[PDB]
Amino acid sequence: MQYKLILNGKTLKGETTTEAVDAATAEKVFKQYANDNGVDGEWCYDDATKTFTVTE
Numbered sequence: 445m446q447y448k449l450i451l452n453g454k455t456l457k458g459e460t461t462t463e464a465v466d467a468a469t470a471e472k473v474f475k476q477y478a479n480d481n482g483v484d485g486e487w488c489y490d491d492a493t494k495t496f497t498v499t500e
């Protein structure tokens with residue numbers, strides 16, 4: 445299933461999508477993505493929209 449991540453960073457802005465088994469797995473992918481790009485923010489998840497949001 446497709447989950448979306450919306451990065452509202454101080455330097456990196458945008459959105460992306462990946463296909464994972466569940467929301468628990470999509471997070472780790474999105475958490476790894478953010479770390480590799482030097483993102484430290486506050487995370488939120490909406491299961492009705494399948495959207496992870498990270499804001500610095």
Ligand SMILES: *SCC1=CC(C)(C)N(O)C1(C)C
Nearest residue numbers: 486487488489490497498499
């Ligand atoms: S999870 C981030 C968040 C929680 C809540 C208090 C419902 N909000 O309004 C935002 C989206 C900031």
